[PDB]
Write a protein that binds this ligand. Structure first.
Ligand SMILES: O=C([O-])[C@@H](O)[C@H](O)CO
Length: 400
């Protein structure tokens, strides 16, 4: 389930890394292949061969050495040779080297990044409406681009047999069978069209259906599709604890948006149960549920489903206090205002030091003199925000 990215430059390495991290990977750029070891392998390793303007033989040697070093410490999973979307550099030498080191029958070259305006049509790269050779990316200063044809570029440095699969054929349900056919026939480099990001999803699904893991070759688009397909477990060390008593439509939508995530757990508070005699045992249960979510790296959303409001706010205050004593969390989000005040009071707070605001409607700071110490606390009034407000709060806590 491990990924190796071998990129030919600084920005390519970073861009691949970012994409992996965004999809839940533990990912690092390792500066010298000589500091690679088994513990660094989970989930992704990125090597920058800094070889775009190097001699072809040097580029080849570095690329192969990166793959070999990863293999030598037990790397197993997927290898992506990150190339320039605009086809600058030692493409053929580096792809051939990576394929040799990978020791599998084929490389899938799916170079497009449609969300960045790079597509592959009939084997040629187009950038924002022009063939690549009618763009700037092709006028030196260091590394000319003499063809928009991926095959033609490759052939400057490698004579490995190639085949192109154009868009209509790419989109067929039998793509994996076609990849297998070409492999069996001795084709080594398979060059695939792409117009939209879904095409890259489809190509990676086909790659995953083969009895070996092909070498992958592409730019940000393919890297993102690979990262997505790995389905990395989303977790955070210090997750948000959210406590929401708001029954507004927008609160439901905000929670629903977070609920879509695999790293979010809801603890639902049946208002009816508050009047039952076993209320305390149920609260103990809800406390346990929240602890289990938070300690296993899920954000935890506690939400309900005159004096009624006060009964509910008091209960949520006591549940929150119970969870804090039982413990984390990375942050505390309280909504609406009645909940914010009831919870603050239950935690012994004397005030709220305001540092700023998230998403134009979520004040944040620290409670003063409370049992949550310097845990960031966020509040939101009932009715405020948009469908992504709570997602914005999750991101805030993830980043700090
Ligand atoms: O693929 C791209 O366009 C970028 O990663 C570029 O190669 C960075 O120099």
């Amino acid at each position: 389930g491990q990924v190796l990215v071998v990129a030919d430059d600084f920005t390519g390495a970073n861009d691949a890394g970012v994409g992996l991290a965004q999809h839940g990977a533990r990912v690092s750029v390792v500066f010298d292949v000589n500091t690679l070891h088994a513990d660094l392998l989970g989930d992704a390793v990125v090597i920058n061969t800094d070889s775009r303007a190097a001699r072809d033989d040097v580029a080849s040697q570095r690329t192969a050495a990166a793959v070999a070093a990863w293999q030598a410490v037990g790397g197993k999973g997927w290898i992506i040779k990150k190339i320039d979307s605009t086809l600058r550099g030692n493409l053929g030498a580096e792809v051939a080297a990576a394929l040799s080191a990978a020791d599998v029958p084929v490389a899938l070259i799916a170079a497009a990044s449609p969300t960045l305006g790079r597509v592959t049509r009939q084997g040629e790269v187009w950038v924002n409406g022009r063939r690549l050779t009618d763009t700037e990316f092709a006028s030196d200063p260091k590394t000319p681009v003499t063809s928009a044809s991926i095959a033609a570029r490759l052939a400057e440095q490698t004579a490995l047999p190639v085949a192109e699969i154009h868009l209509d054929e790419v989109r067929q349900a039998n793509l994996a069978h076609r990849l297998q056919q070409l492999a069996d026939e001795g084709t080594r480099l398979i060059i695939l069209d792409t117009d939209v990001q879904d095409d890259l999803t489809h190509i990676v699904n086909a790659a995953r259906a083969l009895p070996f893991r092909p070498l992958l070759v592409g730019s940000a688009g393919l890297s993102d599709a690979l990262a997505t397909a790995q389905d990395f477990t989303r977790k955070t060390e210090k997750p948000l604890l959210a406590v929401v008593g708001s029954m507004s439509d927008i609160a439901q939508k905000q929670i629903a948006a977070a609920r879509l995530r695999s790293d979010v757990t809801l603890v639902e508070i049946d208002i009816n149960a508050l009047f039952s005699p076993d209320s305390s045992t149920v609260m103990a249960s809800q406390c346990e549920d929240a602890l289990k979510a938070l300690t296993n790296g899920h954000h935890c959303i506690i939400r309900t489903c005159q004096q009624l409001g006060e009964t509910i706010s008091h209960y949520l205050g006591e549940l929150t206090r119970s969870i804090v004593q039982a413990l984390l969390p990375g942050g505390l989000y309280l909504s609406g205002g009645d909940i914010a005040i009831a919870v603050a009071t239950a935690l012994g707070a004397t005030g709220f030091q305001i540092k700023g605001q998230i998403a134009s409607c979520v004040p944040w700071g620290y409670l003063l003199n409370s049992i949550v110490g310097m845990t960031p606390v966020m509040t939101k009034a009932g009715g405020f925000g948009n469908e992504t407000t709570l997602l914005d709060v999750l991101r805030f806590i993830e980043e700090k």
